[PDB]
Amino acid sequence: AVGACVLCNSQTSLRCGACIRRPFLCCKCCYDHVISTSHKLVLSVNPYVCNAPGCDVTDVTQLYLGGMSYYCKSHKPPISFPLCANGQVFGLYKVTDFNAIATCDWTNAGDYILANTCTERLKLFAAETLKATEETFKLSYGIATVREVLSDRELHLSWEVGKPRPPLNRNYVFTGYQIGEYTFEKDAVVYRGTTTYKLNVGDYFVLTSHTVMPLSAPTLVPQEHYVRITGLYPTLNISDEFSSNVANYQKVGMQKYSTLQGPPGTGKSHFAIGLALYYPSARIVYTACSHAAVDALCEKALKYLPIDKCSRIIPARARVECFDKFKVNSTLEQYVFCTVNALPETTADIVVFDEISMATNYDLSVVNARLRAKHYVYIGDPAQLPAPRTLLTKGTLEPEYFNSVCRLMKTIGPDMFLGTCRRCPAEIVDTVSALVYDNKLKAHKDKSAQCFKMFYKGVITHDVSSAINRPQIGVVREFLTRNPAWRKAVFISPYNSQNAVASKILGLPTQTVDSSQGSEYDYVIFTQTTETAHSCNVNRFNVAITRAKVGILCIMSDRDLYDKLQFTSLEI
Numbered sequence: 001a002v003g004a005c006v007l008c009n010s011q012t013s014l015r016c017g018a019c020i021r022r023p024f025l026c027c028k029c030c031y032d033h034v035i036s037t038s039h040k041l042v043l044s045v046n047p048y049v050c051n052a053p054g055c056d057v058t059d060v061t062q063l064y065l066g067g068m069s070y071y072c073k074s075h076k077p078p079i080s081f082p083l084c085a086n087g088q089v090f091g092l093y094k095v096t097d098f099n100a101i102a103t104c105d106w107t108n109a110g111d112y113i114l115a116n117t118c119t120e121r122l123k124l125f126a127a128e129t130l131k132a133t134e135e136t137f138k139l140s141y142g143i144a145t146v147r148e149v150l151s152d153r154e155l156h157l158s159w160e161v162g163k164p165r166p167p168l169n170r171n172y173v174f175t176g177y178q179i180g181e182y183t184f185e186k187d188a189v190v191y192r193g194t195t196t197y198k199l200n201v202g203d204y205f206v207l208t209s210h211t212v213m214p215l216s217a218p219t220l221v222p223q224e225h226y227v228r229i230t231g232l233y234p235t236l237n238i239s240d241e242f243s244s245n246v247a248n249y250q251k252v253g254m255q256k257y258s259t260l261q262g263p264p265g266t267g268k269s270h271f272a273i274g275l276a277l278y279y280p281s282a283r284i285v286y287t288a289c290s291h292a293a294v295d296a297l298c299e300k301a302l303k304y305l306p307i308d309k310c311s312r313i314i315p316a317r318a319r320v321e322c323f324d325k326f327k328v329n330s331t332l333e334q335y336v337f338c339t340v341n342a343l344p345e346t347t348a349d350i351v352v353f354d355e356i357s358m359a360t361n362y363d364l365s366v367v368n369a370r371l372r373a374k375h376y377v378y379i380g381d382p383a384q385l386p387a388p389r390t391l392l393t394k395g396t397l398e399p400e401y402f403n404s405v406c407r408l409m410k411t412i413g414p415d416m417f418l419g420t421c422r423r424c425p426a427e428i429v430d431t432v433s434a435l436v437y438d439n440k441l442k443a444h445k446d447k448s449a450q451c452f453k454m455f456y457k458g459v460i461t462h463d464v465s466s467a468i469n470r471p472q473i474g475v476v477r478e479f480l481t482r483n484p485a486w487r488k489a490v491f492i493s494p495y496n497s498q499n500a501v502a503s504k505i506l507g508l509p510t511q512t513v514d515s516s517q518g519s520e521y522d523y524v525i526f527t528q529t530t531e532t533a534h535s536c537n538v539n540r541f542n543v544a545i546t547r548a549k550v551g552i553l554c555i556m557s558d559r560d561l562y563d564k565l566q567f568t569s570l571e572i
């Protein structure tokens with residue numbers, strides 16, 4: 001019960017009992033907190049409560065120290081001091097932002113803005129408070145019980161009355177009862193068990209509520225600039241393939257941490273793997289939030305790095321199928337590929353943290369706590385999608401507030417920028433360059449003359465709140481009859497329900513914009529589905545159209561984004 005203050009490090013015995021994380025607050029800060037919020041419970045060795053029998057006074061502003069005990073105004077002895085007086089709360093060893101983080105419900109974008117603009121210690125307090133709030137909210141959802149099993153991929157569910165039903169998508173992962181993790185997609189529903197189990201009638205599913213551990217490390221260690229490359233030994237015989245990144249690799253060794261903004265198809269994994277070739281004896285840990293981002297780094301390493309010096313770290317509680325070509329769980333290999341939540345406690349010469357737009361400050365702090373490194377390299381793009389904020393329903397979260405790294409890239413600029421898109425036809429590059437990259441992204445490919453747009457609002461139906469636009473799918477079906485090369489296209493939309501309908505009618509493989517991030521396909525067919533803040537988000541739009549290597553068809557609902565697409569318009 002004795003620790004350091006979350007606002008000024010000052011030692012104290014006080015903790016706020018009303019704060020979900022019970023942070024240590026010194027006398028001067030505890031006061032400024034209790035006197036400005038609904039939080040009045042103060043904790044020490046013993047709580048600050050009226051010691052008089054049967055009395056229920058817990059408010060610190062209505063309590064006094066009567067010798068060594070605590071009493072209210074009704075029970076205090078004549079010789080007593082108020083607990084709250086003179087800008088302090090009585091304790092041993094004798095904030096507007098702290099109050100807002102401590103009392104907010106995390107449903108407003110302004111809550112996330114504050115969590116990223118506050119001091120470093122408050123960024124950790126905000127990250128821990130937010131994550132704990134998110135887990136408690138998982139308890140609010142009703143239990144799903146198997147009413148009947150149709151097949152190996154379809155079943156019927158019975159829901160708990162009086163409790164809301166969580167959204168049905170890949171985002172919401174359930175735990176069967178422990179018959180493995182399971183996901184569902186929309187009376188017949190599609191079930192997806194991580195472990196193959198013959199679904200028993202009567203069995204039930206609940207959201208995996210994990211305990212939020214406290215944070216200790218900053219989101220970003222303090223920056224250090226060096227006069228020479230430090231702790232790393234470069235090659236002189238560096239492959240021509242990687243020559244373009246040599247100055248950037250030297251920048252990496254001459255600073256404690258560095259940020260790399262890599263727009264779609266500009267060479268982020270190529271840069272990441274090339275760093276291993278540039279500092280050939282360096283031990284590098286490659287991390288990202290998702291298994292897919294870690295696997296994409298493994299695929300690039302498989303091509304350039306010796307397979308015997310690589311290891312893919314997989315947590316024993318296996319959720320999705322991941323990279324099989326490296327030795328599994330060998331923490332001491334020179335190259336370690338592992339998701340943030342599975343990171344071991346280790347050291348490295350370089351830590352490469354990829355897909356940085358998807359990280360939260362909680363992830364940034366976890367990395368700094370598990371990995372002690374000479375250099376930290378953050379790779380991603382603040383113009384791409386952030387991690388979903390399940391609690392946030394009011395306001396839009398701007399890229400500068402995704403996390404500390406994205407905030408730096410949007411305010412002072414990234415340390416390094418990969419300026420040439422090698423994936424996309426010039427129509428796509430020119431569109432996103434103007435949209436989100438301030439005209440700094442250059443096209444390498446010519447215009448493919450296979451980038452088309454159609455303005456067609458159609459009809460919007462809804463599967464709960466997830467949207468469907470059957471007429472936009474009908475336009476795609478007509479287009480496919482006329483453009484058979486597009487038979488190989490991936491169908492993309494901002495909605496799972498739109499994708500489920502397109503899958504049955506078109507037979508094309510399907511991705512949401514969010515699940516398509518990091519992937520590329522020759523042909524993409526995109527149906528905007530609706531004109532909402534979700535389907536019009538410029539980062540989501542950017543990711544949607546930069547998935548294409550050769551052609552893209554965009555069936556648009558929004559006039560603004562339609563007019564911005566530098567594509568050939570199709571009639572109807």
Ligand SMILES: [Zn+2]
Binds near residue numbers: 008009010028
């Ligand atoms: Zn303090």
Ligand SMILES: [Zn+2]
Binds near residue numbers: 016017018019039
């Ligand atoms: Zn509090």
Ligand SMILES: [Zn+2]
Binds near residue numbers: 071
């Ligand atoms: Zn009392």
